[PDB]
Design a protein around this ligand. Structure first.
Ligand SMILES: [Fe+2]
Ligand SMILES: [Fe+2]
Ligand SMILES: [Ir+3]
Ligand SMILES: [Ir+3]
Lengths: 515, 515
């Protein structure tokens, strides 16, 4: 729709160097006085070790970024995370640890390249990827402190880079695991808040509940999940991990993680729910059409139903196949051409009935008045779901979604913020009213934003009283190569900017730390 | 959304009497001078024979209506169609022929109650329902002329009340039939235009092509189908006719047509295409989620794809179960309550790829640039489809759709007109831009319109240069009980009205005859 023939988006994938200390950003407009804190973000910063390239978008070495709002000025800083992967790569001047889509050549050494997200646990902050290894970091200085191996504390093989954090600091996550059956399963991990004893909360990790797997030996790729005050929602997609293949290519040949994925063509999507407080899996066989899922938007309870809002990609093909660096660095026509056969992005609201009566076999159970979502109870005992579409644009994804999480996560809500992807290229920011379907767009030419993070006005009365923060890469004609953008959350109108004189590569997720 | 607590919609289902001759309507505003012709419509007019009621909406005895535009004035007329059903009912003072949802009590006597539609064949016009019996009628006087039995001329058991008529007067339809396999199938019937020989074209009926059936002994209920210059599209829904049951309740007990229907829970929807010119069925196994379908909107070819736009109801339950007269005559709260578990209406665009390559197995084949519809080729050879949603409102159907059929039927187009159903109650008229999704609504309180028919301006330059005609029932405070509505097709703004002093019951379909 919008076109980027100048190819500026290639700057999102160009290596940068870390800083020794914070730069001072040149500020435009007016930073709100109540914005005092830090925006922390993780993404790849190093896309080749020497003349050895990294191939996939999720392979480049973790880079930790900070935009600080101190006493009426803004600074920018960045430091590579000192991971085994990074350290060993630097020691030995080559690629040492196999990344998601790049096999290294000379037990199994699983990557700790924490390029995806960062989150609070007790008084600590950890950078993560999606394996068992998270990296404790210093949120003031950006120094690496420690590697943690979650297998030491709990039985999981890995965990998402999207834990849910409750208001009391309790942390919930999900990862696959070995069941007692000698099957695969998915385990919900709970890390408690910092208690009086003042001991590291990770040492108090425990399993809340286990979800079954649709296939005994293949778990689905899980990127995120849903949490309400009373329920956990997990979506099992037809993107499957063939564990066999990476335990056959380690031994004999030589593979990466991407090589294990296969698509199951016939299962579609299975949706699973567990009672959070009683810690039981509920046996409701929710089923629907096939789609990839990376990001839940929000989840909530409305009478005897769960409302589940999702960023979907229609299809069973793995959308990550489209995310190799060569693909993303082609020119504009080839980018558009290459995405023509990709899965098509769509925001969807599914409605899952909680209180199932066989009396209603063969009818639509969704009796709520303001939705077009359906759930049908088959004789089978299967519950077949159709969504209400909330947003749909040709090869235009509303993605990397965020909400006013602190007051509205897990509860009834109205607004969602997101990054607009145009044939996979990030080129706009969106706001979406999920009840009316109104949208708002912020966009400028040759400008490539990141996930918008929302920060509440401390005296907020409405759900969107606050701002949205995005890191924007604007290559071009003598342009400030990048800047931090602050929008008014009500109408996505610009409030301010903090410009810098250096490039910033793609970042995925992060948080705003009030301090 | 809008509420009708006064219950005025019950007047759509109250018996009326025919007229001896045309009333003269009181006209408001300005009838366009180029509107000279006749609006003909069919619907039920008689909902009980004495103290024997008819139960279903599709059971009342056919009533033929005419609004005439002659020399700067408007008339209204109506005559019951003199069918076997009607005539015998009147002769014998009771219900004689079993209707769709009303069994009569004292070979098989199939109904010819032609309450659904009327269409041109050569220089003739026939009222129809969905059986093998159509009734030739006089379009000037509304007199019944003749019963026709299509089994005499072609091998079908019945035919839809939605034939497609080409610009040269050729008529296409579809009905189920016995295959040579001793299976069920669906046959495409072609009736040619009136030729030089001047013989009745029905005598020249022939079979073009046959579609297979998903179930050997159960055909799906078919209400309509798609036609482009090169293709025929047929949609096989999980609403199935159990022929066995009506050939077991005729012999032993005593049933109606509605009693034969069952829903197939596992098949979903199968979509079928045939080459119109070569008269071959194409073996592409299009499949998708379950839905009822009554009305195609329009179909067309866009490069190597068919665009299929449909008024869907999500679910496999038969929507006709909600359409008994008692249900429709309850009060407003009970109407809303009763539809809470019904299938949910949605307008959908499916995109069917024509040129299938196994090289693209597991990918999305829909490479067109302005749609979010997908089609995925499974290993199976199955092609799994997801729609682009064009309109979706909670228990608000865009239904009884019409287009500028003469210039745009079967071809690329932009606008569709429709009747808005609010928990099954007709209470608005809509226009829909199918590319942008903009809508327009005409609505007034305690007013219940019928299917909007579109008539082109004779000097039309754009697709919506013309008017839309609807019959509106407005019961109320000393109100003209009904009127004919003429809207401007561009913005659904009112141009005129032709009021009458008598009630008019529900009508389904019809045509505008330029004369
Ligand atoms: Fe993510
Ligand atoms: Fe119809
Ligand atoms: Ir302020
Ligand atoms: Ir005019």
């Amino acid at each position: 729709q919008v076109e980027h023939p100048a190819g500026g988006y290639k700057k999102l994938f160009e290596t940068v160097e870390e800083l020794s200390s914070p730069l001072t950003a040149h500020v435009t407009g007016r930073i709100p006085l109540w914005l005092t804190g830090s925006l922390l973000r993780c993404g790849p910063g190093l896309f080749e070790v020497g003349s050895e390239p990294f191939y996939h978008l999720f392979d480049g070495q973790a880079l930790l970024h900070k935009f600080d709002f101190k006493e009426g000025h803004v600074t920018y800083h960045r430091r590579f995370i000192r991971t085994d992967a990074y350290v060993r790569a630097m020691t030995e001047k080559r690629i040492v640890i196999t990344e998601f889509g790049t096999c290294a050549f000379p037990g199994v050494e699983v990557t700790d390249n924490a390029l995806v997200n960062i989150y609070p646990v007790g008084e600590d902050y950890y950078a993560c990827t999606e394996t068992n290894f998270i990296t404790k970091v210093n949120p003031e200085t950006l120094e690496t402190i420690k590697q943690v191996d979650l297998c030491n504390y709990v039985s999981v093989n890995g965990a998402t880079a999207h834990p849910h954090i409750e208001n009391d600091g309790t942390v919930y996550n999900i990862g696959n695991c070995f069941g007692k059956n000698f099957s695969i399963a998915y385990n919900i991990v709970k890390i408690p808040p910092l208690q009086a004893d003042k001991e590291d909360p990770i040492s108090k990790s425990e399993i809340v509940v286990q979800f079954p797997c649709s296939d005994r030996f293949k778990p689905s790729y899980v990127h995120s999940f849903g949490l309400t005050p009373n329920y956990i929602v997990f979506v099992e997609t037809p993107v499957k991990i063939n564990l066999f293949k990476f335990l056959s290519s380690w031994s004999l040949w030589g593979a990466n993680y991407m090589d294990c994925f296969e698509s199951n063509e016939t299962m579609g999507v299975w949706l699973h729910i567990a009672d959070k407080k009683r810690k039981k899996y509920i046996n409701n066989k929710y089923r629907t059409s096939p789609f990839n899922l990376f990001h839940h938007i929000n989840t909530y309870e409305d009478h005897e139903f769960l409302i589940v809002d999702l960023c979907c990609w229609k299809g069973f093909e793995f959308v990550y196949n489209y995310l190799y660096l060569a693909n993303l660095r082609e020119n504009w026509e080839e980018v558009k051409k290459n995405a023509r056969k990709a899965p098509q992005p769509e925001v969807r609201r599914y409605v899952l009935p909680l209180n199932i009566d066989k009396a209603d076999t063969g009818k639509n159970l969704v009796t709520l008045p303001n939705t077009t979502a359906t759930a049908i109870l088959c004789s089978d005992e299967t519950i077949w779901l159709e969504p209400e579409v909330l947003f749909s644009g040709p090869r235009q994804a509303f993605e990397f979604p965020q909400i006013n999480y602190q007051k509205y996560g897990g509860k009834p809500y109205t607004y969602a913020y997101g990054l607009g992807l145009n044939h996979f290229v990030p080129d706009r920011l969106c706001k979406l009213n999920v009840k009316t379907k109104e949208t708002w767009v912020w966009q400028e030419p040759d400008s490539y934003p990141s996930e918008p993070i929302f920060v509440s006005h401390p005296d907020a009365l409405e759900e969107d009283d606050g701002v949205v923060l995005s890191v924007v890469v604007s290559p071009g004609a003598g342009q400030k190569p990048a800047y931090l953008l602050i929008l008014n959350a009500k109408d996505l109108s610009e409030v301010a900017r903090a410009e810098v004189e250096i490039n910033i590569p793609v970042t995925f997720h992060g948080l705003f730390k009030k301090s």
